[PDB]
Design a protein around this ligand. Sequence first.
Ligand SMILES: OC[C@H]1O[C@H](O)[C@@H](O)[C@@H](O)[C@@H]1O
Ligand SMILES: [Zn+2]
Ligand SMILES: [Zn+2]
Lengths: 32, 1038, 112, 112
Amino acid sequence: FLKPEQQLERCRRIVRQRVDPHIHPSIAQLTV
Amino acid sequence: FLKPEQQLERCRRIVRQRVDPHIHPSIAQLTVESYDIPGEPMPSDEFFAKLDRGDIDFKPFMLGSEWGTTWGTVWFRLTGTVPAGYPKGKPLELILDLGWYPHSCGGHIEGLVYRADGTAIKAVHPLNYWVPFMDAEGNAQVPVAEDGSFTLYLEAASNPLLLGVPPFIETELGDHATGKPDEPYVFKSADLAEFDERYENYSVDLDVVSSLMEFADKQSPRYWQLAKALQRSLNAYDERNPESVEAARAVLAGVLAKPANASAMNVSAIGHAHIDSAWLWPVRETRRKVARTVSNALALMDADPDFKYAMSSAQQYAWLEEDHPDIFKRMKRRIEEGRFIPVGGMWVEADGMLPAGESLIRQIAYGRKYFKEHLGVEPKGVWLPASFGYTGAWPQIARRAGYEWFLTQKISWNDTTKFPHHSFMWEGIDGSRIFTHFPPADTYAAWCKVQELDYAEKNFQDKDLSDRSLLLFGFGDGGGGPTRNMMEHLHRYENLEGVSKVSIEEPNDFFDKAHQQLAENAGPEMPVWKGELYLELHRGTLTSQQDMKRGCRQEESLLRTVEYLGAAAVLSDPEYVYPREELDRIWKTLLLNQFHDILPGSAIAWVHREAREDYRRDLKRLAEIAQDMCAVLRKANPQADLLAEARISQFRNDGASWHANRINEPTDALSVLTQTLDNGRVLLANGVLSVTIEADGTISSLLDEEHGRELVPAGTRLGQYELLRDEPAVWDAWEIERESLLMANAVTGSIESVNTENGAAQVHVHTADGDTVITTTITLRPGSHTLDFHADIDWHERERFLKVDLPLGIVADQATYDCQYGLIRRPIVKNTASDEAKYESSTNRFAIIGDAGYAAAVINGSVYGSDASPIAGNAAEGRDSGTMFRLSLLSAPTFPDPRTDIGSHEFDWSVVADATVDRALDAAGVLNAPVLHDVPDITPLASIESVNGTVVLDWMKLADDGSGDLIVRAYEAAGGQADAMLHVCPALAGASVHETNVLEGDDLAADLPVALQDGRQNAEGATLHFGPFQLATLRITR
Amino acid sequence: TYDCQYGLIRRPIVKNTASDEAKYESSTNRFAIIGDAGYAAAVINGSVYGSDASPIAGNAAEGRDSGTMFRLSLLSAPTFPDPRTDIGSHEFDWSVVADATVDRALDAAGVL
Amino acid sequence: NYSVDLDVVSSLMEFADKQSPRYWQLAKALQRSLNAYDERNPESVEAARAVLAGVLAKPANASAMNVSAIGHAHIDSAWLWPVRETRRKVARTVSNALALMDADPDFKYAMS
Ligand SMILES: OC[C@H]1O[C@H](O)[C@@H](O)[C@@H](O)[C@@H]1O
Ligand SMILES: [Zn+2]
Ligand SMILES: [Zn+2]
């Protein structure tokens, strides 16, 4: 009834899309 | 002392560095000029017309530059020259590169090559980018001058890659053509090169040996012999001496000539290339993809004998015939030889669940007609490699259409359950059986690799009764097709130890041989699967893009009404002319819109916008045509009384099926009463029902009179809206996950107004969530057992799923749903993991849930997906028991369309308290019938009344000939034996009736029952004996 | 539909999966009912418990239409625990009810 | 012969590389042979032997090794018995070998 592989795939997708971008959110642009 | 892994690594390095570069060594450089079209694609005929009239610049282009826009086209003029007397016995091919991504194929840029005359030669693909230029003795595909100068054209299409290595990423590059360089690619290579077959053969042999070693069952003599042969071949090959590549090839000959095992299965391979009519690209690119695929197949046939290719969709055939007459003529000559096999005999590869039975019949009829009148080929089987499940009425329709076998491979995508058989007999709900085969390779586009063959051998589920499997090889789902490498690999696998015997064979011969072998071996113990082919995946396709389903159902109902009205008018007014051409065009447009990617709703925004425009235009045109036919009928029938607002719905109860009935007919029952309670609760009471509405606009008490039954369990609210978080890991638009359930959030509303327009009570409820507003009208009509709900929704959510709860208070183990031509039963209580996988099924206009002594029905307007669960309560609180039945309304995917179903939507449904099969069919027919105006109350052309059993006359139409005969299609809906007698209009006096097939071909199989005994009879008084879901078809001649 | 101790049970006649095939020999309690939507027939037994049911798919080219083969287990002759098992005289009673409902099946089972 | 065929088929199934066509074909052949054999009818043992003939006539694999077999019987001059019993053991072994040669052609025996 519980499929661990689906949980692993969902975890990888969630980390890639919804968790990692929220780390280091840009607040200002720099001039080079 | 010998390490096979080191040998494998050395072989891979040698192939990468010293063998592959020697294949196609460049001998000349080409000069390139470009002409860009940022907008719509430019037809080839008029392009070449102005080209030979001028009007084109062809600005010079340098190698390594960026050329393409997001959806534009580039025409490249390639000018080159050959060296002096260079073609010394070698083909001297031509190589073009457009910036192919190595880990991608069939989802990005492509191109086609044209001569100066205007005839295509061969398309270019990431894995197949060689174009034949000259022959060994000097024969060239293009004119060449004495100086050797030559010119060619290349039409390159630049399409965005919507499926990258990060799968399912939201994008905005699927709406239209922007004319901007969103992601340009480099060209960097256009060379004229020579062809050396020895190096290619050596590469193929090395690859085959390595792949055989990968699955050679280590610690066996074969593995070590292969390793030793590989080592010796690598040692004997010298790059400095070109001739040594011959001697190395002589080393691998010993191990490659070993005969196959005695028990190895026999595999028949047929060239295939799946092309979706509309998926991640519009139809305009679909036509070009079809042309490129056919050109590639023709080039492969020319360059290689003993190669066969199969093509399925008739619409693509028509598009190719209309666009490229020369390619069509070449394909026709190939067909006459028997090397190009048309399969399927259908307009498109439509979905197997959503379309109605008449839609599938029209698929088959139009496909067969096109195949007979334009190709002279009559397919013997159904070709549907990809489909999100099948209704289970397919075997009867296919068997009555003359088909003999079925093909399918999508069932392999199940989440938890493995289908018990690969080759078997699929039996419908009626009893008709057809021979079905599932390719064990689990794919329709094989790359011709040893690992695919080994997986197919180990995956077969009928090894004890058969040893025949079908392999479909080539590049699919984006065009392309089989390549030369695939043919060479197959030729190597023809007779090899450790690899099954693979031969090129027509699918008909394979199916005949497999069926005969199964009959011989199995006998009494022969596999049979009865029911539907449910797919445990893509369960969200029943709700995504609700406009598609709504338009499909509305168009089908309107087409039924229009054809009935036309048949009635023709038999009354001889001067009337039936609009056959316009109706045929509308039917073909709908059939194309019924594809397995448009109807589910998993394409880009452009495809769905075009489909919505087509639906709206066709609906308006059909309404106008129906109005014209109604006016003609009114003119021809002055004695009848006009009906200002009336509907015609098949199988209306009380023996008034095909009669036009008013919306508001007077009733003996008094007007329904309304009452306001203390806490804002609203009480509605007609003579048969009592409805109580709470302050939040949800039904809490639905009492049925004269039965003492409460239809709402205590502690549950009816009509409550639920919001779910839909964030699937894969296939966002396709999938709704189990984790989405069990976390629905209740959304509360309030009562706004109560009104009584024509004696029917109406209650208005507003529900708000934030930029999303639902306005619900709850209607109770006097003298009726049905409670009606109408909903207007302003969907503005994101990644959310909307559902409505309809508790029933009936303990039932199974629920009955409507099928295309019958009924199906699905479990409500899920005991095993297999049963749990069916947590989201489909409904066809109604569902019935009931115990032994009582039943209630839920009727829906244009909703397909739904689910049912038990409700086990406790007497310590008040909750007794029941069944929670929920309907899926809206969803908001993001991957294919960033804004999906954002806007206004309308829904209609109803609850029938005391319901049987007849009452459910009546309610479903009445609700789905289109509304028309000013119709005479004319006698129906034909009528079918059943003394015992339930017989529904599904369709009446005119024969698709000049004869003008009347075709009547009926079926048994209850599920048991039924007896009926046929009646006809007084105008049809002395007419004769006889039985035909679904295609009106007058030829039917002897195995199937007829249900019309004594053969030809008179139209009036004919007797019919319907079995369970008989689906009889009759033809009446005046 | 078969009789239970204090109710009724439903068992599949058409066996699609391997799990369904494992139930090729079930138990009956004084009667069994087999019927479609509009008709039903009952088999009443005196003291027989084991039985089985299978489909009958015929062809119109010969005359066999369709049906359900319902068989009752009467006697067996094992040898390991008892060398002579059920060797001798036995009596059995059963009946077929043409137009049968739950009430009629219960009536016939009680009377017999 | 039937016993030898059944033993060979069973031992082949024991190492038949399950999930391969050979394993399932051997299983089906064994089941059919067991079903076709009736102990009450002595002649049926012939017909059962005809069922296993199909799977026992399959040719060997191309890469299979070639094995040469020679009759052997190791006899220790003195180990757990005196020499007087060693002489009798030698005589018995030679007598058995001679009887096997008489009762079967194409048999060879080696002595050291
Ligand atoms: O399975 C999803 C997807 O698979 C393949 O790429 C094609 O058949 C598509 O038509 C389909 O939508
Ligand atoms: Zn597809
Ligand atoms: Zn020793």
